[PDB]
Swiss-Prot record:
Homotrimer. Component of a SCF(SKP2)-like complex containing CUL1, SKP1, TRIM21 and SKP2. Interacts with CALR, CUL1, FBXW11, HSPA5, IKBKB, IRF3, SKP1 and VCP. Interacts with SKP2; the interaction with SKP2 does not depend on an intact F-box domain. Interacts (via N-terminus and C-terminus) with DCP2 (via N-terminus and C-terminus). Interacts (via C-terminus) with IRF8 (via C-terminus). Interacts with ULK1, BECN1 and with ATG8 family members, including GABARAP, GABARAPL1, GABARAPL2 and MAP1LC3C/LC3C. Interacts with TRIM21 and SQSTM1/sequestosome 1. Interacts with IRF3. Autoubiquitinated; does not lead to its proteasomal degradation. Deubiquitinated by USP4; leading to its stabilization. Autoubiquitinated. It is found in: Cytoplasm; Cytoplasmic vesicle, Autophagosome; Nucleus; Cytoplasm, P-body. One of its GO terms (molecular function) is RNA binding. The chain holds residues 291 to 468 of 470 of the full protein. Keywords: Cell cycle, Coiled coil, Cytoplasm, Cytoplasmic vesicle, DNA-binding, Metal-binding, Nucleus, Ribonucleoprotein, RNA-binding, Transferase, Ubl conjugation, Ubl conjugation pathway, Zinc, Zinc-finger. GO terms for biological process: negative regulation of innate immune response; negative regulation of NF-kappaB transcription factor activity; negative regulation of protein deubiquitination; positive regulation of autophagy; positive regulation of cell cycle; positive regulation of protein binding; protein autoubiquitination; protein destabilization. GO terms for cellular component: autophagosome; cytoplasm; cytoplasmic stress granule; cytoplasmic vesicle; nucleus; P-body; ribonucleoprotein complex. This is E3 ubiquitin-protein ligase TRIM21. It comes from Mus musculus (Mouse). Residues 8-185 form the B30.2/SPRY domain. Induction: Up-regulated by IFN. E3 ubiquitin-protein ligase whose activity is dependent on E2 enzymes, UBE2D1, UBE2D2, UBE2E1 and UBE2E2. Forms a ubiquitin ligase complex in cooperation with the E2 UBE2D2 that is used not only for the ubiquitination of USP4 and IKBKB but also for its self-ubiquitination. Component of cullin-RING-based SCF (SKP1-CUL1-F-box protein) E3 ubiquitin-protein ligase complexes such as SCF(SKP2)-like complexes. A TRIM21-containing SCF(SKP2)-like complex is shown to mediate ubiquitination of CDKN1B ('Thr-187' phosphorylated-form), thereby promoting its degradation by the proteasome.
C-alpha cells in the first residue's frame, strides 16, 4: 500500500481509559495493570473491558497510523464513533459504531456482525490502520508481511466523528501483559 503519507500522530485519552489501564507519560503506550489505577470514575471510561480511545477526532480526510502488538495473545484495534456506549456489555460491530479487527485464541477476526474469519499466514507484530472518511473505508494492513492487506470495511456509515479505538485485552492467562504501542512515523 501507499497510505504512509497520511500518517497522523495519535495519543491516548486517559479520561476514556478503563480504570485498570496504565498509559505512558508520552500517551503513546497502554497496558493492563494488575489492579485499579487509583483514578476517579467518569461517564467517558469504558467500564467492562480494557478499552481506551485516542484523543484525536476525525470528521474528514484520509488518516493512517500503526500499532505494535508484539507478544500479545488478545487485543482489538480500529476506529469507533465518538458516541459509542462506554458502560455495560456490548459487541464490537458497525451497528454499535465500531470498525475493528481482533486476535483471540490464536485466530484473527473482523468485527462484522456476525464476525468474519481473517486469513493471516504471518502473525503481525505491527498493524497499519487506514481511514478514508469521505469514501467510507477502514482498512487494516500487516506491517510484518510487507504491508499486505488484512481486511477492508467498505460502505461504512460512520454517522459521527471517529476516534482511534484500542483494547489491550484481559490477562487471565499471564501471557497477555504486553502493551499496545503507537509506532513512530
Ligand atoms: O458501517 C457499516 C458497515 C461497514 C461495513 C460493514 O458495515 N454499517 C452497516 C451495518 N449497519 C446497520 O445495518 C445499521 C443497523 C442498521 C451499521 C452501518
Amino acid at each position: 500500500h501507499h497510505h504512509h503519507h497520511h500518517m497522523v500522530h495519535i495519543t491516548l485519552d486517559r479520561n476514556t481509559a478503563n480504570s485498570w489501564l496504565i498509559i505512558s507519560k508520552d500517551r503513546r503506550q497502554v497496558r493492563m495493570g494488575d489492579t485499579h489505577q487509583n483514578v476517579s470514575d467518569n461517564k467517558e471510561r469504558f467500564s467492562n473491558y480494557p478499552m481506551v480511545l485516542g484523543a484525536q477526532r476525525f470528521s474528514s480526510g484520509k488518516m493512517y497510523w500503526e500499532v505494535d502488538v508484539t507478544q500479545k495473545e488478545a487485543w482489538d484495534l480500529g476506529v469507533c464513533r465518538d458516541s459509542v456506549q462506554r458502560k455495560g456489555q456490548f459487541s464490537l460491530s458497525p451497528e454499535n459504531g465500531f470498525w475493528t479487527i481482533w486476535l483471540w485464541q490464536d485466530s484473527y477476526e473482523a468485527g462484522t456482525s456476525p464476525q468474519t474469519t481473517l486469513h493471516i499466514q504471518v502473525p503481525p507484530c505491527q498493524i497499519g490502520i487506514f481511514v478514508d472518511y469521505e469514501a467510507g473505508v477502514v482498512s487494516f494492513y500487516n506491517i510484518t508481511d510487507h504491508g499486505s492487506l488484512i481486511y477492508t470495511f467498505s460502505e461504512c456509515v460512520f454517522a459521527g466523528p471517529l476516534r482511534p479505538f484500542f483494547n489491550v485485552g484481559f490477562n487471565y492467562s499471564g501471557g497477555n501483559a504486553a502493551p499496545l504501542k503507537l509506532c513512530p512515523l
